[PDB]
RNA sequence: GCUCUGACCGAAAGGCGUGAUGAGC
């Protein structure tokens, strides 16, 4: 995954919360995809463990939900407007960014073809 | 120990989304 396309996602995410709705933390993120409410899922690459966020990759591709990998969990942290680093996040409501997001959805899907 | 909740607990230092708090089992 790109670092250029990565800064984009974080941007969307940080604003997405201003209008739409976002879920922060592996626990809520997982339960989000399991309930088909995961528009997009963010995953940090710098996790401790691994065994703590490893299940997500699979669950998304099988739930037909897009997942994006990000460099630092701290970045995913300040994006979510949280104080503690976040290891994973899932946006459940695109909000007033929907369209602006749908484009990002394809850029990732067009990264695995 | 787990389930649900999901942002606070603390005088402070600090400790929490790798899960504060509060239900339950």
From Swiss-Prot:
Multifunctional RNA-binding protein that recognizes the K-turn motif in ribosomal RNA, the RNA component of RNase P, box H/ACA, box C/D and box C'/D' sRNAs. Part of the 50S ribosomal subunit. Probably part of the RNase P complex. It comes from Archaeoglobus fulgidus (strain ATCC 49558 / DSM 4304 / JCM 9628 / NBRC 100126 / VC-16). Belongs to the eukaryotic ribosomal protein eL8 family. GO terms for cellular component: cytoplasm; ribonucleoprotein complex; ribosome. Keywords: Cytoplasm, Ribonucleoprotein, Ribosomal protein, RNA-binding, rRNA-binding, tRNA processing. It is found in: Cytoplasm. GO terms for molecular function: ribonuclease P activity; rRNA binding; structural constituent of ribosome. Signal peptide: none annotated. Pfam families: Ribosomal_L7Ae. This is Large ribosomal subunit protein eL8. GO terms for biological process: ribosome biogenesis; translation; tRNA 5'-leader removal. PANTHER family: RIBOSOMAL PROTEIN L7AE FAMILY MEMBER. Its main location: cytoplasm. InterPro entries: eL8/uL1-like (IPR050257), Ribosomal_eL30-like_sf (IPR029064), Ribosomal_eL8-like_CS (IPR004037), Ribosomal_eL8/eL30/eS12/Gad45 (IPR004038), Ribosomal_eL8/Nhp2 (IPR018492), Ribosomal_eL8_arc (IPR022481). SUPFAM superfamilies: L30e-like. The gene is rpl7ae.
């Amino acid at each position: 995954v790109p670092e250029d396309m990565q800064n984009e996602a974080l941007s969307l995410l940080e604003k997405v919360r201003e209008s739409g709705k976002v879920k922060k933390g592996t626990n809520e993120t997982t339960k989000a995809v399991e309930r088909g409410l995961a528009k997009l899922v963010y995953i940090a690459e710098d996790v401790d463990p691994p065994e703590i966020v490893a299940h997500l990759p699979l669950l998304c591709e099988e739930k037909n939900v897009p997942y994006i990998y990000v460099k630092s969990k701290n970045d995913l942290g300040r994006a979510v407007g949280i104080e503690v680093p976040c290891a994973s996040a899932a946006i459940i409501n695109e909000g007033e960014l929907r369209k602006e997001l749908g484009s990002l959805v394809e850029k990732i899907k067009g990264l695995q073809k």
